[PDB]
Curated annotation (Swiss-Prot), chain A:
Biological role: Involved in protein export. Acts as a chaperone by maintaining the newly synthesized protein in an open conformation. Functions as a peptidyl-prolyl cis-trans isomerase.
Coiled coil: none
Protein name: Trigger factor
Pfam family, one: Trigger_C
The organism of origin for this protein: Vibrio cholerae serotype O1 (strain ATCC 39315 / El Tor Inaba N16961)
InterPro entries: PPIase_dom_sf (IPR046357), PPIase_FKBP_dom (IPR001179), Trig_fac (IPR005215), Trigger_fac_C (IPR008880), Trigger_fac_C_sf (IPR037041), Trigger_fac_ribosome-bd_bac (IPR008881), Trigger_fac_ribosome-bd_sf (IPR036611), Trigger_fact/SurA_dom_sf (IPR027304)
Gene coding for it: tig
Amino acid sequence: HMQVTVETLEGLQRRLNITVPAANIEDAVAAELRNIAKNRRFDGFRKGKVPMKMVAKMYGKAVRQDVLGEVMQRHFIEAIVKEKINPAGAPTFAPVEIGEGKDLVFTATFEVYPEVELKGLENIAVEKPADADVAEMLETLRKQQATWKEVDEAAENGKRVSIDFVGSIDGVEFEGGKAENFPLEMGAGRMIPGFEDGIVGKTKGMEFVIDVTFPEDYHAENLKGKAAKFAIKVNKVEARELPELNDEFVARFGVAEGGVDALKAEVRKNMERELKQAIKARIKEQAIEGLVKENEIQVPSALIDQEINVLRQQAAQRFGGNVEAAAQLPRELFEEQAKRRVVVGLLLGEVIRTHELKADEEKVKALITEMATA
Amino acid sequence: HMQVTVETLEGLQRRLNITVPAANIEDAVAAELRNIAKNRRFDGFRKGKVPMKMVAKMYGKAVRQDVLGEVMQRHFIEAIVKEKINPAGAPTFAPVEIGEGKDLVFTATFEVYPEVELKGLENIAVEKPAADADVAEMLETLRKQQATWKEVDEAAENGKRVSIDFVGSIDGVEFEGGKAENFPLEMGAGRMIPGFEDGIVGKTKGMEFVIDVTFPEDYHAENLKGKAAKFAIKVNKVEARELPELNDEFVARFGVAEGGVDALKAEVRKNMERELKQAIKARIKEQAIEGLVKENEIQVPSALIDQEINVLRQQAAQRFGGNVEAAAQLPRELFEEQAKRRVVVGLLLGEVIRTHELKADEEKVKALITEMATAY
């Protein structure tokens, strides 16, 4: 097996230290020499069987440069994959140990894509688990076209419960423990355990106190493991009624891809409103202690794929149009960049759509690439 | 029993008419449908199997439009690879018959690259007889580029470069264009019409004589098509070829830890620029010199055509063919010609840049090269 170690450097600069079993290089160099001997006519000898010693003195080095170049690349890609690292540039190889008969050791220095989440957009967009194509999207369009409506029901998984709450320890209200019209989506696990798990069953108008202890891994210093009380008031309980998934719900879009795009245009349009909302809420949900997960929008896999296909194209360019190499890279490598791409696109798209701003699709896309890949 | 026909329209417009057997579609619609009721559950039935018509009434028209979209793209690419077509832009599909249970029929209209013919550079670059290893190959190439010829007391033989002066005439009449001076005849290169060399072979410097020969029934000279003639040769000077030694030292400056392949490639281009300039200058002098059957040319390492092809294959991928997985199966001959031009135009601007140490954006020069090579 081949070995690799990853080093982080200044900036988005990483270095890979790959080692390759000597056998690989040595076996291949031998073979090719045997080939050259068998298929090259040398002055003074008949095709095939010529002093091996001779062919080695004429192509020994040369063949080693090629076997070497092939081995580095093949293992650079294999490392990248195994190390789940998405290069944002071409790698610069360096020979550490290329001695004949000895294990191959070389370095692969290069740049990667930044990891820091976008300001105010940290983990704001996510992909469903894993429905297997234009199905999950019809569903996404279904939920986006869904409307929340009040119901005389109680708070249970699925329902959205608007609540007001003010936390306190010994009758003393700590900072950021008071929230009005907070929308708690039962089942979303967005609050410190014990919270939600004690509002379930309550209906509109009820006021009550729940005891909740903050987790050890809790961020706030002054609340870490403190026992607390939250005075809750349930403002209302809504249910989401999803429209039907019938034929007239899909005839609105054209035929073939034109249709499969008219629909993507629509899903995108809604995500523009959903992200705007998600962001506003994020503001209002800052400082609100008890929260242990920021809100988020769900992006159909079909839409993340469109971005991953772009990332692959770009990766192929940075590898000299080596398309097969780009295909070999597993999807999860670009998953992150894709999400950043989708969000920046929705950000810009919302401004453009709202004021009917006319801008060349190509320029916008260039900027999205720049802003997303930061 | 699928049917695919190509129809040439006006100019660079082409149209694919594709028919897909209903069963190909209905099945695909089925597989996806089956694959839905066996992966996700809806509010109504167990996390397991559901009504045939349920999943179908819910995802019928949708899954189908999805499959149709996916299918047109795939057949367009297969149709293009089969027909050896290189689209200049994304195709425009138009459904012709999409009715359920019926055969899928659709057209794909688009344009193809105009057939660019670089003036004075027609077939000037040849790829070592195709249709190995990058370093090994370009070393054999660097070697020949360094070879030099020097006069020797030898007779004209295969491999020898015999400078000569000849003047052909049919019947006492020295026909037009049959006059040449100091023509480097590389024995064995088969550059002249059959029989020309076959009669000079053996002679040496000084020697002035005459020989016969008969033009090919298919020679471009409407006045020489077959008529036999006579050239008054004159072996000016015989030269021999001396290639450098191919050993450990001849390649050190190219070691993985020494410039590497990039240094070597740079060296080969550096040499080729010169050869090309010479080849172009030699192109002219030989124009209208009847007797010469093949236009001169320079040899390019496939390693360098490959670099160009990769770039072009990736570019075809973006234009049409969507994703990279699709470009990964496009055949090489689809881009052989455009690659050769990229190399050529690349040496044209290269020589001008190196000679005057002109500094310019490597990315801009490429764009320019790309454009001149495709001329679209």
